[PDB]
Design a protein around this ligand. Sequence first.
Ligand SMILES: [Mg+2]
Lengths: 94, 119, 166, 141, 82, 83
Amino acid sequence: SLKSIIRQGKQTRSDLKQLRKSGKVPAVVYGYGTKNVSVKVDEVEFIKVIREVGRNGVIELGVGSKTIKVMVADYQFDPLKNQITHIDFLAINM
Amino acid sequence: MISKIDKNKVRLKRHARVRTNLSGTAEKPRLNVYRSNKHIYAQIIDDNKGVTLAQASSKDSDIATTATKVELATKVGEAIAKKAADKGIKEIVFDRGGYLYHGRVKALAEAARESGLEF
Amino acid sequence: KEKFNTEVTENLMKKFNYSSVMEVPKIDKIVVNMGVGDAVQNSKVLDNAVEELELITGQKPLVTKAKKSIATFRLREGMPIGAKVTLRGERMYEFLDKLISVSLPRVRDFQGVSKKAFDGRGNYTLGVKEQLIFPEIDYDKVSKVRGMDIVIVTTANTDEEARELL
Amino acid sequence: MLLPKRVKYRRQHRPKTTGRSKGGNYVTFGEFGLQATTTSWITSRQIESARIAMTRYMKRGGKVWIKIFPHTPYTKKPLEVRMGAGKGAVEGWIAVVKPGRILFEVAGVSEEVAREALRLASHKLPVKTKFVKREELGGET
Amino acid sequence: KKGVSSTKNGRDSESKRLGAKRADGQFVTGGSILYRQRGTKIYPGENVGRGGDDTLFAKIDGVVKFERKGRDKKQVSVYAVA
Amino acid sequence: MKQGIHPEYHQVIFLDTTTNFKFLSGSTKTSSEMMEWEDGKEYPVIRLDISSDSHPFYTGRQKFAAADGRVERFNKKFGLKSN
RNA sequence: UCUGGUGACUAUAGCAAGGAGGUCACACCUGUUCCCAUGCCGAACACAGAAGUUAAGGUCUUUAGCGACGAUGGUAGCCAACUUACGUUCCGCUAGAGUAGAACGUUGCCAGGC
RNA sequence: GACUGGGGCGGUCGCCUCCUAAAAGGUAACGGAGGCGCUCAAAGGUUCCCUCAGAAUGGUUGGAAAUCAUUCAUAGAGUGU
RNA sequence: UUAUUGGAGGUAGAGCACUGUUUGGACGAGGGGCCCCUCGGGUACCGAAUUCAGACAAACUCCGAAUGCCAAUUAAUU
Ligand SMILES: [Mg+2]
C-alpha cells in the first residue's frame, strides 16, 4: 500500500527511455476519483506490491496529497527485456 | 409468428424509392398523400425551407367522417387548391407516397386540377 | 365448416386463459403441392387431377437450383395452390379420407412452431370424388396454418375440429 | 528435403517476407516455452526434427505444442542455370520468426526436463533462444 | 538454361489514368470533370450529372465540396459561387 | 377470380332437415351413419360409404367392429385342448 | 410538449427482453356489388363498410445482455538530422490500431390536432 | 522480322482487369494470376411490382439435392460474359 | 518554399468482420467398420453443427498513421 512517487509532466519525449533505464516507471490512474493523471513509480517496490496484496488488491497510490485506492487494471510487459511499462490503475468506487 | 406488418413501412420504402428518381422540392413544391383506412390527409412542403405550406385533413377538423369515400377525397383535393390560391403556387409536383395512381388518390389529384392548380 | 369454428372459438378460450378473443388462432392458409423427379407429358394430368379436386388451376414453377445429376436443369415441376377464405373453411370439412390402411393418424408434430398438419397421400379419393380413371397415383402434400407460438393450441384446434390424434 | 507440414496452396508462387522486428506473443497454453530471439527464419523440416527430440527425451508422455505453422513457400530453381526466366518451382515451406515468437511450449513436467529438451532443440535450429516461464502476459482483459 | 521454357505471363501496359481531377476550394466551370471512378465509389449530390462510365461533373459553375452521407459512402456537391 | 380458368358442377337434391335450399353445397348419402350432409362445394349426390362416424377414427374410439371374437375364441380353444 | 404526418442528423437512434393503452390517431378487422386486381388465390393490391378488440402491428416506460461510439496515457511505424552496415542504435516532429475507462435505450425543423 | 541476361531452339508480339506500385496519378522485368477477337429484337428503353442464397423442422421425387412449408437469415446470392 | 484550413486514397502498421490458411481444447449431429445383439449397443477417426483461446497473407481487410499530392478572391519571403 506504500509507494513513493514523482509526478509526471505528460510531455516527456522518447528520451523517457532514461526513466525506464533508471528503474523508474510511468503509469496513470483514473476512473471514479478524478479524470486523468500521469505519474512515475519504481518497478522494484511495485513487484514487491504485487506479492504484498495480490494482483487485484487495493493499493494506495502516491501523490503527495491524498493517496487514492486502486485495483490495478493492466500493464504492457515486453519480452526480451523482462520488465513492465505503463502500469494502469483505477480509482475505484466506494 | 406470421404477421401482416404495418403497411406504412413498405409504404415508406415505396415513398423514398420515387424520391430517388427525384422529389422536385427545389423545382416547385411537392404534394404528398397519406391514406388511413378511415380517412385521408395531405400536405405541401418544400426544401431546404422545410416549410409545410398546405394541410387538408378531413377528420382532424371536420369530424365524424364517417365512411372513407372517393368523393370525400375530392373535397380535400379541392380544398388544398383553394388554400393554395392565397399563395398561388404553382403547377406542383405530386408525390404518390407509395401508392398507386388508380383512385381514390387519383380522384384527389383529378379534382385538384379542377380548381386551377395544374401539373 | 365455420359452424364448428364458433364452437372451438369457445373451447380454446375455456381451455387457455387468454384475455382476448384476438389472441385466439384463426383460419389461415392451405398449401397443396405436387412434384416429379422428372415428367414430360404427365403435367397435363397433374393439372387435370388437381383442377378436378380444387376449383382453380395449379401452376408450374421450376427447379431453379443448378442440378445436373438427377436430371437436367429447369424441368417443369409443381402444382401449388393458395386455398383461402371460404373455399378453405369448406375444404377442411372435405376431409373424409380413409382409403384402406389409414390406421396411422399421424400425431407426430409437423413443424415445431404452430403449423401442425395432416400431410398426406393418394388420388384414389380424398374422401371425395372416387375417379378410378388414372395413369398413376400421386402423393398430394399439404400444409396448414394458425398464427400461434406453439403446436399444442393447434393440436387442440384441429382436435376440437375432430382430428384423429393417435 | 522433407515437407510433411503442408496445406492447400491457394497459389504456388509468392514474394517473400524478410524479417525486421517485433515483440510479444506470450505463452497461453502450457507453462514452459521457448522464445526465439534473433536473426533467421525457418523451414518445416527443422521443426519436425525438433519435435522428434522433444518427444523422445520426454517419456511420461509430457505435452507439447507448436504455436506456428509454415503458411508460405520457398522457391528454388534448377541446378546450374542462367538467370532470367520465370520464377522457379517449389522447394520448401516457411514459418517466419521475428524476435519474440514462442515456437515450442510444454507442460505436464517439471522445470528441468523441459529445459533439457529445449536445449536439445535450440541446438537444432538457426535462431538463438531463451527459456521462459508462464507467469505473466502483458495484458489480461 | 536460356529459353527453357515458360510463360510469360505479364500483360503489363494496361492503363487508363483514373482518379480525381479537382479539389475542394476550387472554382470550377460547367461541364467540368471532378472525379473519375467506377461503380459509385462516390455518389453525386446537387448540381451534378453522371455518365455512362460513372464519371462525375458539374452541370453548372460553382465550388466543389465533398461530404459524408451514411458512415461509408461519400458524395460530391457543387454549391453556388457567390 | 379469373374468368376462363374456372370450372363448375351440377347434381343434385338438397336435403330434408333444414329449409329446402341448396347453398352451392353438397348432399352426401351414407349408409352406416346416414347424414345427408349438405356440406360440399362440388358434386352431389354422392353414394359414399362413411360419414366419419362409420369408422372408429374420426369421431373417436367406438365398438365399431370386432376384432375380438378371433383372439378370445382361438385362445379358449387351445386352452380347452390341453385342459 | 401529448399524439400524428413530413424533413434533417455518423446506429449515441439500433438490436434482444419485459411492463402498459386504445371507438379521438392507427391498426387489426366484416365482406367482395361496383373501381380494379391476384401468373393459383380479394392472401397482396383495390373498392365498399365499421360487427368485434388492444392480442398483434405501431406508440410510451425500463433495462447496457448483443452491436455501433470511445477518449487520456504509453507502445509499433515513420518525415528530418548524427552515427553506423548494424535483420542498426541514439536524438527531434508527428501520431495509430488493439484496449481499459467512460458514453449510449436518440436529437432538432415545419404543418395540423392538443 | 525484333525482343532476347552472348546468340540459337523454345515463348511472346494488339487490347481489358488485378498485384508488384512505395496511402493522387504514372511507374519496367523472359515477374506473378485470368481472359477477349462476341452475344441480345430482348438480356434494350420506360411505367409499375417484388427481394435472394444459405439454415431449422414435417413431408412422394428422399446426395435431408427437385417443388412445398414457415422461422432465422445485412446481402454470404444474382448481376449475358 | 513555409504557415493555416479543407480534401481524394487505403501503403506501413494492426487485425480476423468477408476470402482462404492454421493449432489445441470444447465438442454431439452423427456415423464407418472389428464385435455384441440378430431392435439397438456402436466400441479410434471424423465432416459440419456451435464455441473458448492463440496465429498467418502482395493478388483478405471492421480499421489506418507519418510523408507526399491537389486548391485556397488567405498571410511572410523570394
Ligand atoms: Mg504486414
